[PDB]
Design an enzyme around this catalytic site. Structure first.
Site, mmCIF file in Angstrom:
data_model
loop_
_atom_site.group_PDB
_atom_site.id
_atom_site.type_symbol
_atom_site.label_atom_id
_atom_site.label_comp_id
_atom_site.label_asym_id
_atom_site.label_seq_id
_atom_site.Cartn_x
_atom_site.Cartn_y
_atom_site.Cartn_z
ATOM 1 N N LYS B 228 0.975 -1.181 -0.076
ATOM 2 C CA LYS B 228 -0.145 -0.093 0.110
ATOM 3 C C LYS B 228 0.800 0.880 0.026
ATOM 4 O O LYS B 228 0.944 1.999 0.800
ATOM 5 C CB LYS B 228 -0.800 -0.063 1.252
ATOM 6 N N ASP B 281 -5.229 -3.038 -1.315
ATOM 7 C CA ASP B 281 -6.634 -3.156 -1.393
ATOM 8 C C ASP B 281 -7.278 -3.467 -2.862
ATOM 9 O O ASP B 281 -8.412 -4.256 -2.832
ATOM 10 C CB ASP B 281 -7.111 -1.731 -1.103
HETATM 11 MG MG LIG Z 1 -10.485 1.601 -1.139
#
Ligand SMILES: [Mg+2]
Ligand SMILES: [Mg+2]
EC number: 1.1.1.42
Lengths: 414, 414
Positions: B228, B281
């Protein structure tokens, strides 16, 4: 300064907690980068059609284009990705809606969306995910999913407090940790990047209070605190404990015998809302295997980022998923997908996410009838298999529609 | 001291990188808490049967019970949850296997498994997830999943460097951050817990090197760095860049035109391994919607924790998922599920996870034939629908078996 504030149209007012919406409110919108050029015209047209239908011409929205991202550099100059006046205008006019935004690499510019969220203190990221009958799904039973994600938006590792490996600053906080704090747990102190994850009591109680309140107001069956508290005891573990503590102290929570779970009685329907918690990695399994056990979800920033995304993919909604960023003084509704530049200008992507964030916007304004007409239109279009390419690829017997044509299909099923 | 080291049996030796396994090696095992009492006897019996079958009596394992967790307090005294000699014995005897462990709350005792992992520097958490034909699954096409997770095990927010809200220590590092480091990004500096996420260059290169090497040795099609990094630039973003840098520098990676993706040529099969990255994600959606694009996965501690769990749930394997913790000097194979105390002693849970971690153990010893006989037995039992309660609930036409009986069913399908 380059925004042309609409001649007809009146500002929404915040009269102590309550929104005071005129019949002709000025609503700011940020078009967005990439496919924003396609989906934002489709959303302005179906919203306009839905309030035209619901209030028979008495209400009208005065749309006002404001700027962020790449279109902002084309309007104000190469250097300005987030104009200071966009922040004042969202705050002033109270609700706004936006398409997807590009943040550049190579300039030391952190995510523009997270800048909006923190700069305006929009501490609730509200993500509702439910199945729309007939959308193609990867799982056997997507209809069992109807959850509402309350993701804390102002702290966690997203605050952006971090230092580069081998930088003087990183050297300095690793020195402080080892010498003045005596941490012997950094495996490799050299060439080491450092991130700070903060979690406060006010930060989690204001988010959890909003989640329990939403459950009472919509009489939802439970509120699940999800966390990875067994490993992160003083941030994630503190979140879960402050959440149970607020359910006890402010909502009169009672032990469901033996605990740890609580019962909150809805002051209006008389029902009992279960306040529970589950560990975050086990929750990622549970939403797949037992999605009917869960309802309103309260969690921290990063966990909400992952939960949201995984949940939108199982109900076949990665491109129709709505989202709201709500603070006490304003709110910013949004397309939750990216800019997809390859397809931009081709009129082909799904306008579903920003249109469903526009119904969340409307519902928040108290224009419930208009909001209801949009989800009726949405259920109709999808069921009629009169759909855009991302859905049609996975459907047998569907008619393929452009981005704009699907807008008209939503108005037609209203 | 309370371990009775086996009379017959010889230690495995590490002769410079290479394991030197005798025909009668002593293998330590930690039984485990809760359902460990059920699943560990089933695994000792099928492993014994599989090496009896493969080597026609020439090889034998000398099992040696060592102690951690709750059984450790019953053997050494109330205060000792992790005996110092368990750490020396795993290191000395080189490979060990374990059941699920209980860590107590109320004593300030951090996760015993993470203590094992860090204390012995078992920096690779290896999690293979593939579909076994006929296990009940929540998704439409689970057979498209065949991934191998390389999760970094020695750093990230799991290092356990954190301080309590309102504690003197927390006050002190928040003071250092605000005054000496000038951080203005902590929304609520009061009643604030603090976590430190470290990510170093040696930490990620030693994990990624193991992942690419596994892809060459088993000629897997790609290695995906998941991170991320757009939000955590100097930890997660650094991981991805150090991973691409090591593929270029040590494995002769080349741009798949324009980049960012690389091509590594397998020095043995001549094929090209794609080195790519995807944001974490979005990866959580991609494994559901496009699982055939991914193969070997390299990621940090927390992300690997989530990816592992979500992936094991979609192929219907939450209770048959194997796991290994591998360092340079020793390895610890394990049941990846919890202790499930409600069912303990009832002989009813799935012995599948620890039995499949025992085949990973065997394969690592070079006893490939024995290892192969166990997955043959496993595929047979499951296909014969001669299965334990967790699977039988979801199957129509299955015969319900006890934990121990499923052990015999695996030996029967060998
Ligand atoms: Mg998101
Ligand atoms: Mg896990």
């Amino acid at each position: 300064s380059k925004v042309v504030v609409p001649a007809q149209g009146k500002k929404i007012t915040l009269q102590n907690g309550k929104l005071n919406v005129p019949e002709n409110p000025i609503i700011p919108y940020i078009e967005g980068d990439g496919i924003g050029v396609d989906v934002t015209p489709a959303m302005l047209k179906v919203v306009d059609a839905a309030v035209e239908k619901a209030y028979k011409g008495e209400r009208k929205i005065s749309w006002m284009e404001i700027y962020t991202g790449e279109k902002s550099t084309q309007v104000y100059g190469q250097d300005v990705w987030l104009p200071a006046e966009t922040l004042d205008l969202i705050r002033e006019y109270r609700v706004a809606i936006k398409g997807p935004l590009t943040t550049p690499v190579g300039g030391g510019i952190r995510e523009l969306l997270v800048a909006l969220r923190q700069e305006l203190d929009l501490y609730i990221c509200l993500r509702p995910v439910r199945y729309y009958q007939g959308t193609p799904s990867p799982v056997k039973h997507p209809e069992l999913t109807d959850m509402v994600i309350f993701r804390e938006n102002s702290e966690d590792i997203y605050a952006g407090i971090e230092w580069k490996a081998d930088s003087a600053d990183a050297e300095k906080v690793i020195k402080f940790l080892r010498e003045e704090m005596g941490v012997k747990k950094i495996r490799f102190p050299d060439h080491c990047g450092i991130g700070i994850k903060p979690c406060s009591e006010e930060g989690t109680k204001r988010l959890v209070r909003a989640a329990i309140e939403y459950a009472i107001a919509n009489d939802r069956d439970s509120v699940t605190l999800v966390h990875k508290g067994n490993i992160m005891k003083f941030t994630e573990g503190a979140f879960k404990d402050w959440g149970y503590q607020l359910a006890r102290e402010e909502f009169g929570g009672e032990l469901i015998d033996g605990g740890p779970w609580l019962k909150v009685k809805n002051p209006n329907t008389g029902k009992e809302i279960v306040i529970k918690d589950v560990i975050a990695d086990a929750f990622l399994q549970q939403i797949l295997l037992r999605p009917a056990e869960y309802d309103v979800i309260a969690c921290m920033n990063l966990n909400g980022d992952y939960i949201s995304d995984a949940l939108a993919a199982q109900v076949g909604g990665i491109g129709i998923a709505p989202g709201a960023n709500i603070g006490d003084e304003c709110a910013l509704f949004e397309a939750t997908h990216g800019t997809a530049p390859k397809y931009a200008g081709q009129d082909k992507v799904n306008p579903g996410s920003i249109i469903l964030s526009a119904e969340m916007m409307l519902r928040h304004m108290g224009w419930t009838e208009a909001a209801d007409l949009i989800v009726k239109g949405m259920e109709g279009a999808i069921n009629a298999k009169t759909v855009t390419y991302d859905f049609e690829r996975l459907m047998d017997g569907a008619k393929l529609l452009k981005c704009s044509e699907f807008g008209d299909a939503i108005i037609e099923n209203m």
